[PDB]
Amino acid sequence: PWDFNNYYSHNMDGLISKLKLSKTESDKLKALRQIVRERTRDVFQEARQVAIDVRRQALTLESVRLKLEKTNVRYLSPEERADLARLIFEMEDEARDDFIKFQPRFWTQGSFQYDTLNRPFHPGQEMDIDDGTYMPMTVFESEPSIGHTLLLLLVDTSLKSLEAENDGWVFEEKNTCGRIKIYREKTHIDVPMYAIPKEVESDKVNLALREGVRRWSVSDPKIVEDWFNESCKRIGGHLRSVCRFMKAWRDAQWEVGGPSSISLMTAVVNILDRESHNGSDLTGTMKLIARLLPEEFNRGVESPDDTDEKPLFPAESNHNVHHRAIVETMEGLYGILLAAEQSESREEALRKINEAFGKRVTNALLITSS
Ligand SMILES: Nc1nc2c(ncn2[C@@H]2O[C@H](COP(=O)(O)OP(=O)(O)OP(=O)(O)O)C[C@H]2O)c(=O)[nH]1
Ligand SMILES: [Mg+2]
Ligand SMILES: [Mg+2]
């Protein structure tokens, strides 16, 4: 049978090389992130100035709106400009004091932070940067002091101003963040908005929600970051590799949608924690993962953040048809890895395993007899 260890891990031409970004590419994403950060800083500063002038100069609501229409708030729709005008006009002294005193902070969460960001594969897919905006403020036991709509409209202001001023830059509203899509760079940047104490305890990291009936959700991304980094320590460095590969498999099977990265990561560490394996043997390890992955999602995948009320993926008895489509797709993986392994020719093995991870590795000479 064929060994795929070099298919997976060979420098420059192996799968990890096709997935992982170079320093040049990473620096590009950082530069793109910096553009969004600086603009959001500007927007917050512009808003803060008007927030100052409100109580300072006893402004009318109209005077507030007209000032905001000299800033980046210009690019919101009329109702949104009026709404932000009202919010800044009528924010309480305590909330106003916080807003004026503190600048927003920026910290990246997700795969760009714990190094699992893959290159995109299908034409529509994009590299994903999760850069959160954090506002220091009084955070009571019940909720943050500053209204969630205000902060969300300031994020929208930033991204919509970037959209309006740049071609290829398109704003998209998600449930948990504002997203700016940069077509020319095959990159989009997710901007979740957070409220945090100004005095960071994870029990006070509040995420501002954009859809539904709940305004805030206590969700510290640091918890997932800490959990995954500790998992890499516990299981071994090959965890990032096998997580990258599974995400690559997901990107190959789904142009859009499919199981989330977090659920994939959690399922993999659950397997690798439970089952004895050889980290150095990526061929066997990936085969182990593929075999057991559907049963993990059948068992249900609980969030590594215990504060979450719902699991990342329900138990089988709670699976809807969309869940089943995912699991049945997962069941297909193990068969692909074994057919490749038992392919009669070397070029046949490559084409077969590339049905799982997509045509990225093209060098059949990486495949060696076991
Ligand atoms: N608690 C919790 N946190 C989530 C969930 N989904 C995303 N997050 C937070 O958002 C961060 C980024 O999420 P994703 O963009 O979907 O995954 P990723 O790690 O960045 O991988 P990818 O390259 O595919 O973007 C990681 C995690 O802290 C979730 O369902 N529950
Ligand atoms: Mg991400
Ligand atoms: Mg994202």
Coordinates of all heavy atoms in Angstrom, one line a residue, residues 309-365:
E309 N -24.5 27.5 25.8 CA -25.7 26.8 26.2 C -25.9 25.6 25.3 O -26.5 24.6 25.6 CB -26.9 27.7 26.3 CG -26.9 28.7 27.5 CD -28.1 29.5 27.5 OE1 -28.8 29.6 26.5 OE2 -28.3 30.2 28.5
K310 N -25.6 25.8 24.0 CA -25.8 24.8 23.0 C -24.5 24.2 22.5 O -23.5 24.8 22.5 CB -26.5 25.4 21.8 CG -27.9 25.9 22.1 CD -28.5 26.9 21.0 CE -28.5 26.1 19.6 NZ -29.1 27.0 18.6
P311 N -24.6 22.9 22.2 CA -23.4 22.2 21.7 C -23.0 22.7 20.3 O -23.8 23.4 19.6 CB -23.8 20.8 21.6 CG -25.2 20.8 21.4 CD -25.7 22.0 22.1
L312 N -21.8 22.5 19.8 CA -21.3 22.8 18.5 C -22.1 22.0 17.5 O -22.3 22.5 16.4 CB -19.8 22.6 18.3 CG -18.9 23.4 19.3 CD1 -17.5 23.0 19.1 CD2 -19.1 24.9 19.1
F313 N -22.4 20.8 17.8 CA -23.1 19.9 17.0 C -24.0 18.9 17.8 O -23.4 18.3 18.7 CB -22.1 19.1 16.1 CG -22.6 18.7 14.8 CD1 -22.5 19.5 13.7 CD2 -23.2 17.4 14.6 CE1 -23.0 19.1 12.4 CE2 -23.7 17.0 13.4 CZ -23.6 17.8 12.3
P314 N -25.3 18.8 17.5 CA -26.2 18.0 18.3 C -25.9 16.5 18.3 O -25.2 16.1 17.3 CB -27.6 18.4 17.7 CG -27.3 18.7 16.3 CD -26.0 19.5 16.4
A315 N -26.4 15.8 19.3 CA -26.3 14.3 19.2 C -27.2 13.9 18.1 O -28.1 14.6 17.6 CB -26.8 13.8 20.6
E316 N -27.0 12.6 17.7 CA -27.7 12.1 16.5 C -29.2 12.2 16.5 O -29.9 12.4 15.5 CB -27.2 10.6 16.3 CG -27.7 10.0 15.0 CD -27.1 8.7 14.7 OE1 -26.3 8.2 15.5 OE2 -27.5 8.0 13.7
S317 N -29.7 11.9 17.7 CA -31.2 11.9 17.9 C -31.8 13.3 17.7 O -33.0 13.5 17.6 CB -31.5 11.4 19.3 OG -31.0 12.3 20.3
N318 N -30.9 14.3 17.7 CA -31.3 15.7 17.5 C -30.9 16.3 16.2 O -31.1 17.5 15.9 CB -30.8 16.6 18.7 CG -31.4 16.2 20.0 OD1 -32.6 15.9 20.1 ND2 -30.6 16.3 21.1
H319 N -30.3 15.4 15.4 CA -29.8 15.8 14.0 C -31.0 16.1 13.1 O -31.9 15.3 13.0 CB -29.0 14.7 13.4 CG -27.6 14.6 14.0 ND1 -26.7 13.6 13.6 CD2 -27.0 15.3 15.0 CE1 -25.6 13.8 14.3 NE2 -25.7 14.8 15.1
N320 N -31.0 17.3 12.5 CA -31.9 17.5 11.4 C -31.3 17.1 10.1 O -30.1 16.6 10.1 CB -32.3 19.0 11.3 CG -31.2 20.0 11.2 OD1 -30.1 19.6 10.6 ND2 -31.3 21.2 11.7
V321 N -32.0 17.3 9.0 CA -31.5 16.7 7.7 C -30.2 17.4 7.2 O -29.4 16.8 6.6 CB -32.6 16.9 6.6 CG1 -32.8 18.4 6.3 CG2 -32.2 16.1 5.3
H322 N -29.9 18.6 7.7 CA -28.7 19.3 7.3 C -27.5 18.8 8.1 O -26.4 18.7 7.5 CB -28.9 20.8 7.6 CG -30.1 21.4 7.1 ND1 -31.2 21.7 7.9 CD2 -30.5 21.8 5.9 CE1 -32.2 22.2 7.2 NE2 -31.8 22.3 6.0
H323 N -27.8 18.3 9.3 CA -26.7 17.7 10.1 C -26.3 16.3 9.5 O -25.2 16.0 9.4 CB -27.2 17.4 11.5 CG -27.4 18.7 12.3 ND1 -28.6 19.1 12.8 CD2 -26.5 19.6 12.7 CE1 -28.4 20.3 13.4 NE2 -27.1 20.6 13.4
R324 N -27.3 15.6 9.0 CA -27.1 14.3 8.4 C -26.3 14.4 7.1 O -25.5 13.5 6.9 CB -28.5 13.6 8.1 CG -29.3 13.2 9.4 CD -28.4 12.6 10.4 NE -27.6 11.4 9.9 CZ -26.7 10.8 10.6 NH1 -26.3 11.2 11.8 NH2 -26.1 9.7 10.1
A325 N -26.6 15.4 6.3 CA -25.8 15.6 5.1 C -24.3 15.8 5.4 O -23.5 15.3 4.6 CB -26.4 16.9 4.4
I326 N -24.0 16.5 6.5 CA -22.7 16.7 6.9 C -22.0 15.3 7.4 O -20.9 15.0 6.9 CB -22.6 17.7 8.1 CG1 -23.0 19.1 7.7 CG2 -21.2 17.7 8.7 CD1 -23.0 20.1 8.8
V327 N -22.7 14.6 8.2 CA -22.2 13.3 8.7 C -22.0 12.3 7.6 O -21.0 11.5 7.6 CB -23.2 12.7 9.8 CG1 -22.6 11.4 10.3 CG2 -23.4 13.7 10.9
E328 N -23.0 12.2 6.6 CA -22.9 11.3 5.5 C -21.7 11.7 4.6 O -21.2 10.8 3.9 CB -24.2 11.2 4.8 CG -25.3 10.6 5.6 CD -26.5 10.1 4.7 OE1 -26.3 9.9 3.5 OE2 -27.6 9.9 5.3
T329 N -21.4 13.0 4.5 CA -20.3 13.4 3.8 C -19.0 13.0 4.5 O -18.0 12.6 3.8 CB -20.3 15.0 3.6 OG1 -21.5 15.4 2.9 CG2 -19.0 15.4 2.8
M330 N -19.0 13.1 5.8 CA -17.9 12.7 6.6 C -17.6 11.2 6.5 O -16.4 10.8 6.4 CB -18.1 13.0 8.1 CG -18.1 14.5 8.4 SD -18.4 14.8 10.2 CE -18.1 16.6 10.2
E331 N -18.6 10.4 6.4 CA -18.5 9.0 6.3 C -17.8 8.6 4.9 O -17.2 7.5 4.8 CB -19.8 8.3 6.4 CG -20.4 8.3 7.7 CD -21.9 7.9 7.8 OE1 -22.5 8.0 6.7 OE2 -22.4 7.6 8.8
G332 N -17.9 9.5 4.0 CA -17.2 9.2 2.7 C -15.7 9.4 2.7 O -15.0 8.8 1.8
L333 N -15.2 10.1 3.6 CA -13.8 10.4 3.7 C -12.9 9.2 3.9 O -11.9 9.0 3.2 CB -13.5 11.4 4.8 CG -12.0 11.8 5.0 CD1 -11.4 12.3 3.7 CD2 -11.8 12.8 6.1
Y334 N -13.3 8.3 4.9 CA -12.5 7.2 5.2 C -12.3 6.2 4.0 O -11.2 5.6 3.9 CB -13.1 6.4 6.4 CG -12.3 5.3 6.9 CD1 -11.0 5.5 7.4 CD2 -12.8 4.0 7.0 CE1 -10.2 4.4 7.9 CE2 -12.1 2.9 7.5 CZ -10.8 3.1 7.9 OH -10.0 2.1 8.4
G335 N -13.3 6.1 3.2 CA -13.2 5.3 2.0 C -12.3 5.8 1.0 O -11.6 5.0 0.3
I336 N -12.2 7.1 0.9 CA -11.3 7.8 -0.1 C -9.9 7.5 0.3 O -9.0 7.2 -0.6 CB -11.6 9.3 -0.2 CG1 -13.0 9.5 -0.8 CG2 -10.5 10.0 -0.9 CD1 -13.5 11.0 -0.7
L337 N -9.5 7.7 1.6 CA -8.2 7.5 2.0 C -7.6 6.1 1.9 O -6.4 5.9 1.8 CB -8.1 8.0 3.5 CG -8.4 9.4 3.8 CD1 -8.2 9.7 5.3 CD2 -7.6 10.4 2.9
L338 N -8.6 5.1 1.9 CA -8.2 3.7 1.8 C -8.1 3.3 0.4 O -7.3 2.4 0.0 CB -9.2 2.9 2.6 CG -9.0 2.9 4.1 CD1 -10.3 2.4 4.7 CD2 -7.8 1.9 4.5
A339 N -8.9 3.9 -0.5 CA -8.9 3.5 -1.9 C -7.6 4.1 -2.5 O -7.0 3.4 -3.4 CB -10.1 4.1 -2.6
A340 N -7.2 5.3 -2.1 CA -6.0 5.9 -2.5 C -4.8 5.0 -2.1 O -3.9 4.8 -2.9 CB -5.8 7.3 -1.9
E341 N -4.8 4.6 -0.8 CA -3.8 3.7 -0.2 C -3.6 2.5 -1.0 O -2.5 1.9 -1.1 CB -4.2 3.4 1.2 CG -3.4 2.3 1.9 CD -3.7 2.1 3.3 OE1 -3.7 3.1 4.1 OE2 -4.0 1.0 3.7
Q342 N -4.7 1.9 -1.6 CA -4.7 0.7 -2.3 C -4.8 0.8 -3.8 O -5.0 -0.2 -4.5 CB -5.8 -0.2 -1.7 CG -5.6 -0.7 -0.3 CD -6.9 -1.1 0.3 OE1 -7.8 -0.3 0.5 NE2 -7.0 -2.4 0.7
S343 N -4.7 2.1 -4.3 CA -4.6 2.3 -5.7 C -3.4 1.6 -6.3 O -2.3 1.5 -5.7 CB -4.5 3.8 -6.0 OG -5.7 4.5 -5.6
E344 N -3.6 1.0 -7.5 CA -2.6 0.2 -8.1 C -1.4 1.0 -8.6 O -0.3 0.6 -8.6 CB -3.2 -0.6 -9.3 CG -2.9 -2.1 -9.3 CD -4.0 -2.9 -9.9 OE1 -4.1 -3.0 -11.1 OE2 -4.8 -3.5 -9.1
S345 N -1.7 2.2 -9.1 CA -0.7 3.1 -9.6 C -0.5 4.3 -8.7 O -1.4 4.7 -7.9 CB -1.0 3.6 -11.1 OG -1.6 4.8 -11.1
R346 N 0.6 5.0 -8.9 CA 1.0 6.1 -8.1 C 0.2 7.4 -8.4 O -0.2 8.1 -7.6 CB 2.5 6.4 -8.2 CG 3.0 7.6 -7.4 CD 4.3 7.4 -6.8 NE 5.1 6.4 -7.6 CZ 6.4 6.1 -7.3 NH1 7.0 6.7 -6.2 NH2 7.0 5.2 -8.0
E347 N 0.0 7.6 -9.7 CA -0.8 8.7 -10.2 C -2.3 8.5 -9.8 O -3.0 9.5 -9.6 CB -0.6 8.9 -11.7 CG -1.4 7.9 -12.6 CD -1.6 8.4 -14.0 OE1 -0.9 9.4 -14.3 OE2 -2.3 7.8 -14.8
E348 N -2.7 7.3 -9.7 CA -4.1 6.9 -9.4 C -4.3 7.2 -7.9 O -5.4 7.7 -7.5 CB -4.3 5.5 -9.7 CG -5.7 5.0 -9.2 CD -5.9 3.5 -9.4 OE1 -5.2 2.9 -10.2 OE2 -6.8 3.0 -8.7
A349 N -3.3 7.0 -7.1 CA -3.4 7.3 -5.7 C -3.5 8.8 -5.4 O -4.3 9.2 -4.5 CB -2.1 6.8 -4.9
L350 N -2.8 9.6 -6.2 CA -2.9 11.0 -6.0 C -4.2 11.6 -6.4 O -4.8 12.3 -5.6 CB -1.8 11.7 -6.9 CG -1.9 13.2 -6.9 CD1 -1.6 13.8 -5.5 CD2 -0.9 13.8 -7.9
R351 N -4.7 11.2 -7.5 CA -6.0 11.6 -8.0 C -7.2 11.2 -7.0 O -8.2 11.9 -6.9 CB -6.3 11.0 -9.4 CG -5.5 11.7 -10.5 CD -6.2 11.3 -11.9 NE -6.4 9.9 -11.9 CZ -5.6 9.0 -12.5 NH1 -4.4 9.4 -13.0 NH2 -5.9 7.7 -12.5
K352 N -6.9 10.1 -6.3 CA -8.0 9.5 -5.5 C -8.0 10.3 -4.1 O -9.1 10.7 -3.7 CB -7.7 8.1 -5.2 CG -8.9 7.3 -4.7 CD -10.0 7.4 -5.7 CE -11.4 7.1 -5.2 NZ -12.5 7.0 -6.2
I353 N -6.9 10.5 -3.5 CA -6.8 11.2 -2.2 C -7.1 12.7 -2.4 O -7.5 13.4 -1.5 CB -5.4 11.0 -1.6 CG1 -5.4 11.5 -0.1 CG2 -4.3 11.8 -2.4 CD1 -4.2 11.1 0.7
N354 N -6.9 13.2 -3.7 CA -7.2 14.6 -4.0 C -8.7 14.8 -4.2 O -9.2 15.9 -4.5 CB -6.4 15.0 -5.3 CG -5.0 15.5 -4.9 OD1 -4.6 15.5 -3.8 ND2 -4.3 15.9 -6.0
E355 N -9.5 13.7 -4.1 CA -10.9 13.8 -4.1 C -11.4 14.2 -2.8 O -12.5 14.8 -2.6 CB -11.6 12.5 -4.5 CG -11.3 12.1 -6.0 CD -12.0 10.7 -6.3 OE1 -13.0 10.4 -5.6 OE2 -11.5 10.0 -7.2
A356 N -10.5 14.0 -1.8 CA -10.8 14.4 -0.4 C -10.4 15.8 -0.1 O -11.1 16.6 0.5 CB -10.2 13.4 0.5
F357 N -9.1 16.1 -0.5 CA -8.5 17.4 -0.1 C -8.5 18.4 -1.3 O -8.0 19.5 -1.1 CB -7.1 17.2 0.4 CG -7.0 16.2 1.6 CD1 -6.6 14.9 1.4 CD2 -7.5 16.6 2.8 CE1 -6.5 14.0 2.4 CE2 -7.4 15.7 3.9 CZ -6.9 14.4 3.7
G358 N -9.0 18.0 -2.4 CA -9.0 18.8 -3.6 C -7.6 18.7 -4.3 O -6.6 18.3 -3.7
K359 N -7.6 19.1 -5.6 CA -6.4 19.1 -6.4 C -5.5 20.3 -5.9 O -5.6 21.4 -6.4 CB -6.6 19.2 -7.9 CG -5.4 19.2 -8.7 CD -5.8 19.5 -10.2 CE -4.5 19.8 -11.0 NZ -4.8 20.1 -12.4
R360 N -4.6 20.0 -5.0 CA -3.7 21.0 -4.5 C -2.2 20.5 -4.6 O -1.4 21.1 -5.2 CB -3.9 21.4 -3.0 CG -5.4 21.8 -2.7 CD -5.4 22.9 -1.8 NE -6.6 22.9 -0.9 CZ -7.0 23.9 -0.1 NH1 -6.3 25.0 -0.1 NH2 -8.1 23.8 0.6
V361 N -2.0 19.3 -4.0 CA -0.8 18.6 -4.3 C -0.9 17.9 -5.6 O -1.8 17.2 -5.9 CB -0.5 17.6 -3.2 CG1 0.8 16.7 -3.5 CG2 -0.3 18.2 -1.8
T362 N 0.1 18.1 -6.5 CA 0.1 17.6 -7.8 C 1.3 16.7 -8.1 O 1.3 16.1 -9.2 CB 0.1 18.8 -8.9 OG1 1.2 19.6 -8.6 CG2 -1.2 19.6 -8.8
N363 N 2.2 16.7 -7.2 CA 3.4 15.8 -7.3 C 3.2 14.4 -6.8 O 3.3 14.1 -5.6 CB 4.6 16.5 -6.6 CG 5.9 15.8 -6.9 OD1 6.0 14.9 -7.7 ND2 7.0 16.3 -6.3
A364 N 2.9 13.5 -7.8 CA 2.6 12.1 -7.4 C 3.9 11.4 -6.9 O 3.8 10.4 -6.2 CB 2.1 11.4 -8.7
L365 N 5.0 12.0 -7.2 CA 6.3 11.4 -6.7 C 6.5 11.5 -5.2 O 7.4 10.9 -4.7 CB 7.5 12.1 -7.4 CG 7.6 11.8 -8.9 CD1 8.9 12.4 -9.5 CD2 7.5 10.4 -9.3

